[PDB]
């Protein structure tokens, strides 16, 4: 169920029927790989298989050495996205801390350990290379006289070591911080059991499991420490504390007058475009809709990229002049043509000499737009063209509603219209019109006294009197 | 040593104790791979190992063919990031030039070759596939009758050739230009010796070597030419010509009035936020702090993204009204709530009905913010909440200083306050305020003293004179 409404009066459109999935917090897990401590490689044999093992063993050592060294968005605040993961990582460098983890995962690959003052973190041994080399390769490289391993062991070691190598690879060019988190950092099975053991509700575990590909784009892997044959990196996972609240997407486009003289027109655009989601009695507003990822009718966002607004903000759609919320807009005289592709259609702002049409796949051009702001639904329409720019529309199913109404730009007197307000809103523009109206009413009042008061009489030895608005010589009436 | 100061007066905060690392230049090295020239593959043998070699040999040829075809940021200038790498690449296309290099690296893998009029470039043959194929696979594929190579050679060839394939892979999907420079382009050992052999000071070498992962992220690899069995790509490395000069980070947030009536509030924000570093008697300013990367107390930036300012720019911190530098600000009425997480704490801009709190890990909420702009240190605080947005604070050690002062937004008369100057400054705002203030200072002066003047005598055929404050017919005195 997805529906959409277009408002002609304000040149904007709302798509609804979406369900929320909001990242509200962060969970930090600690992922470990048990390592082997092999300094020198003792073997003088030039057997081909053993020769390969030392080269492969060297890639392991080399990997170790490398790892050893290590629109309205502008209104948003500024966070430290991995501040929490790093903090957990800082605790891990303290002495004895690593020793705690190694002991916990002694008899299991999964265990919970609480750090410092109360934080409970999940721990995961995803690869035991210590055990593999010490029970497989130790007999072949712990002695001069060397046990020429079967060819199948060489292959097996490359497979097991490869994960370490790829993991090592990612961190070296990302300064210990990667995103999205690859399947090298954490396999699907690893992630799924991680999700199951997380201190979260059942609803969240299910949401994450059916959308694991999204979890990766919103996760961070943080390289932390290598010490005492334990490799550990912190993985910071999104917590979606808000799921399945109604969401809607607001699309906007410039609304201008259509007078013949090109330099005489004024324009206005709603600046409050973006994603909106009901959230905890408020409305979460995401001005940069590109920070959200859409999966069918579910929308995943990050509250770090949101404002918290009164729910009355929705009113701007039905009544942009409502007295309860100051709907945000920008003004200009830049009447250029463009289009905004919506969920279920397309808004067309066609002005000037721009060629604007809509076509169907098989029929060709079926509608020609006149000057103004208009809309077409995706039913029976496949493409829209504005000037030399071709737009393909979304073909998703859903009903559109065209809400007719007078373009609000018509409600403004161009002689006092503030055409240079960028970070504006309805009340502010009105407010400014008031200052502009004040300054013309009063200026006229002052000019309303240019001639009704009397001037100086000429400076000569003669006397004067007043008549018909001008000075007359006194000698005249004598 | 990191300290921080919050200025209540300007809703901003300065973090200090940082050390500089500014990329000021570029060094271009030429990395080469010596190639084998193998047209046709002569073998009718269907041996599995030899069959594998032709498939592996084909990936090599295919790789060759692919390679053969081959806030205040708006104030910044515009550079050409790889202009330097490209120029060297242009030099590499001349005929006598390649022969020089090929000859230079004949008996060594490391060599200096001087190009055109004086540029000395370091050259590096990192892989000799020519030698490997010509001494290993040559006996098996230069003849119909083919020598069924041991299974270990197939693997080794796959290992050695593999480096070439990824490099080709990277270049093929990046149009010959990659960044960061991967370890396929340049291994850790290779890079480290390159830095050491570079014509730079000891200070730079030490700094770069302990932070090679950053060096990689700030480097470019530029695919240049394949000719006469030599493959060469240019690697453009950052030169950090300014090190260990003091740096500081400026954080800012909106400072608004807190009157009861909604939409009646006015706001102001310092626009000069970003990283600052002392540099050559001036101050280098990086407005988009995301272009800089911080590791502990070292800060890496790129001068291509900086402005060069007089050191008096620092005065905006102590006296935003100082007469010597025009501190830059923007104004608006959009009083939405948010927080800016600093190095050692958090700035909170809390307005309206927004819920704003700070919590501890174990204790929970320990401070509730009132309306206005405020700050809390990271000592004893773990998280901050503004509206529906959760912020994790930075847990780095360091002292904060709360600098008390009247919020400067209180110094403005709201009736003449220009709330919609975006690209503004202190002096610029004052100038406009004076003009709005001037026309009221004078209009009231004129409306007074206007009534001290005499109105026009009635306009008829009769003459008039003044007496007792009124006009009297001249006929009376006759």
């Amino acid at each position: 169920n997805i529906t959409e409404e277009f408002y002609q009066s304000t040149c904007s459109a709302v798509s609804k029927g979406y369900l929320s999935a909001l990242r509200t917090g962060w969970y930090t897990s600690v992922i470990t790989i048990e390592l082997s401590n092999i300094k020198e490689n003792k073997c003088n044999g030039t057997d081909a298989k053993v020769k390969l093992i030392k080269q492969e063993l060297d890639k392991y050592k080399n990997a170790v050495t490398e790892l050893q060294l290590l629109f309205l968005g502008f209104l948003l605040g500024v966070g430290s996205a991995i501040a929490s993961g790093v903090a957990v990582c800082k605790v891990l460098h303290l002495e004895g801390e690593v020793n705690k983890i190694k002991s916990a995962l002694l008899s299991t690959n999964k265990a919970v350990v609480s750090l410092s003052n109360g934080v409970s973190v999940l721990t995961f041994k995803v690869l035991d290379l210590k055990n593999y080399i010490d029970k497989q390769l130790l007999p072949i490289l712990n002695k001069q006289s060397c046990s020429i391993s079967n060819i199948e062991t060489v292959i097996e070691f490359q497979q097991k070591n490869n994960r370490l190598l790829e993991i090592t690879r990612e961190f070296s060019v990302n300064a210990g911080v990667t995103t999205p988190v690859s399947t090298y950092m954490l396999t699907n099975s690893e992630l799924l059991s991680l999700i199951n053991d997380m201190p979260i509700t059942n609803d969240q575990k299910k949401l994450m499991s059916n959308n694991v590909q999204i979890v990766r784009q919103q996760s961070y892997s943080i390289m932390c420490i290598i010490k005492e044959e334990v490799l550990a990196y912190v993985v910071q996972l999104p917590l979606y504390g808000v799921i399945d609240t109604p969401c809607w997407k607001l699309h906007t486009s410039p609304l201008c007058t259509t007078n013949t003289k090109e330099g005489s027109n004024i324009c206005l655009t709603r600046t409050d475009r973006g994603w909106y989601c009901d959230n905890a009695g408020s409305v979460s507003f995401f001005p940069q809709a590109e920070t959200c990822k859409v999966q069918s009718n579910r929308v995943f966002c990050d509250t770090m990229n949101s404002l918290t607004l009164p729910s009355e903000v929705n009113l701007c759609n039905v009544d942009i002049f409502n007295p309860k919320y100051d709907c945000k807009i920008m003004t200009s005289k830049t009447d250029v043509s463009s289009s905004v592709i919506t969920s279920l259609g397309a808004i067309v702002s066609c002005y000037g000499k721009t060629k604007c049409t809509a076509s169907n796949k098989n029929r060709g051009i079926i509608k020609t737009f006149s000057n103004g702001c208009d809309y077409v639904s995706n039913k029976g329409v496949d493409t829209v063209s504005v000037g030399n720019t071709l737009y393909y529309v979304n073909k998703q199913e859903g009903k559109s509603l065209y809400v007719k109404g007078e373009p609000i730009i018509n409600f403004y007197d161009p002689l006092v219209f503030p055409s240079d307000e960028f970070d504006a809103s309805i009340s502010q523009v009105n407010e400014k019109i008031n200052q502009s109206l004040a300054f013309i009413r009063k200026s006229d009042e002052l000019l309303s006294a240019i001639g009704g008061y009397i001037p100086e009489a000429p400076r000569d030895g003669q006397a004067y009197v007043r008549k018909d608005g001008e000075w007359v010589l006194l000698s005249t009436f004598l | 040593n990191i300290t921080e100061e919050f200025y209540q007066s300007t809703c901003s905060a300065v973090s200090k104790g940082y050390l500089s690392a500014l990329r000021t230049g570029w060094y271009t090295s030429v990395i080469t791979i010596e190639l084998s020239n193998i047209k046709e593959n002569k073998c009718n043998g269907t041996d599995a190992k030899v069959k594998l070699i032709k498939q592996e040999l084909d990936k090599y040829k295919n790789a060759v063919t692919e390679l053969q075809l081959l806030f205040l940021g708006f104030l910044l200038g515009v550079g050409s990031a790889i202009a330097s790498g490209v120029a060297v690449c242009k030099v590499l296309h001349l005929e006598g030039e390649v022969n020089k290099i090929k000859s230079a690296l004949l008996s060594t893998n490391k060599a200096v070759v001087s190009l055109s009029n004086g540029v000395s470039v370091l050259t590096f043959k990192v892989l000799d596939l020519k030698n490997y194929i010509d001494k290993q696979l040559l006996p098996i594929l230069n003849k119909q009758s083919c020598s069924i190579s041991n299974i270990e050679t197939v693997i080794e060839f796959q290992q050695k050739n593999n480096r070439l394939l990824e490099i080709t892979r990277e270049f093929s999907v990046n149009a010959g230009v990659t960044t960061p420079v991967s370890t396929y382009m340049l291994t850790n050992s290779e890079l480290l010796s390159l830095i050491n052999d570079m014509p730079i000071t000891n200070d730079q070498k030490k700094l770069m070597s302990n932070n090679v992962q950053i060096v990689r992220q700030q480097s470019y690899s530029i695919m240049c030419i394949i000719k006469e069995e030599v493959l060469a790509y240019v690697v453009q490395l950052p030169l950090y010509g300014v090190i260990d000069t003091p740096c500081w980070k400026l954080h800012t947030s909106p400072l608004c009035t807190t009157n009861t009536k909604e939409g009646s509030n006015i706001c102001l924000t310092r626009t000069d936020r970003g990283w600052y570093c002392d540099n050559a008697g001036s101050v280098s300013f990086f407005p988009q702090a995301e272009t800089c990367k911080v590791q502990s107390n070292r800060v890496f930036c790129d001068t291509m993204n900086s402005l060069t300012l007089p050191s008096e720019v620092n005065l905006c911190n102590v006296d935003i009204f100082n007469p010597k530098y025009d501190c830059k600000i923007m104004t608006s009425k959009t009083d939405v709530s948010s927080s800016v997480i600093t190095s050692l704490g958090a700035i909170v801009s809390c307005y309206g009905k927004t819920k704003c709190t700070a919590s501890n890990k174990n204790r929970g909420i320990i401070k509730t913010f009132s309306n206005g702009c405020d700050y809390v240190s990271n000592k004893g605080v773990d998280t901050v909440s503004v509206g529906n947005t959760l912020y994790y604070v930075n847990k780095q050690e360091g002292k904060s200083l709360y600098v008390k002062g009247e919020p400067i937004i209180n110094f403005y008369d709201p009736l003449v306050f220009p709330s919609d100057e975006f690209d503004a400054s202190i002096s610029q705002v004052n100038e406009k305020i004076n003009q709005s203030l001037a026309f009221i200072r004078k209009s009231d002066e004129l409306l007074s003293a206007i009534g001290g003047y005499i109105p026009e005598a009635p306009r008829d055929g009769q003459a008039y004179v003044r007496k007792d404050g009124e006009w009297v017919l001249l006929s009376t005195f006759l």
């Epitope: 509200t24 509250t303 | 819920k355």
Partner: nanobody, 123 residues
């Protein structure tokens, strides 16, 4: 304004049952997540159960999962923790806690914003 008050604590025999109640005041449950925590004597405090007010979706830590069940009454603005088959090792002080769903960051002592004053349970 916002306050929580737990009740229902007392002495139980092993294998016995007990229900705790958590009265919310100053807010409504719908906008929040409600959690139950415990601290046994001398031991660090550990999470036990969280619930979503809206959907009623639930979370049980591994240690008590199956034996303990949590429920909520929106009308009474109260959250209940039913405990079945109590063991002496379950002896602890039980705290009620909550966080705005807007600020939700997981169940766990480091993830709570408001705390009740507690009620003592002894098996």
């Amino acid at each position: 304004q916002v306050q929580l008050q737990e009740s229902g604590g007392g002495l139980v025999q092993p294998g016995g049952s007990l229900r705790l109640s958590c009265a919310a005041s100053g807010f409504t449950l719908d906008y929040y997540y409600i959690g139950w925590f415990r601290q046994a004597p001398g031991k660090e405090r550990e999470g036990v159960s969280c619930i979503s007010s809206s959907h009623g979706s639930t979370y049980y830590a591994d240690s008590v999962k199956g034996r303990f069940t949590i429920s909520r009454d929106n009308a009474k603005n109260t959250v209940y923790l039913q405990m079945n088959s109590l063991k002496p090792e379950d002896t602890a002080v039980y705290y009620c806690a909550t966080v705005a769903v807007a600020h939700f960051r997981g169940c766990g002592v480091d993830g709570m914003d408001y705390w009740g004053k507690g009620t003592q349970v002894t098996v």
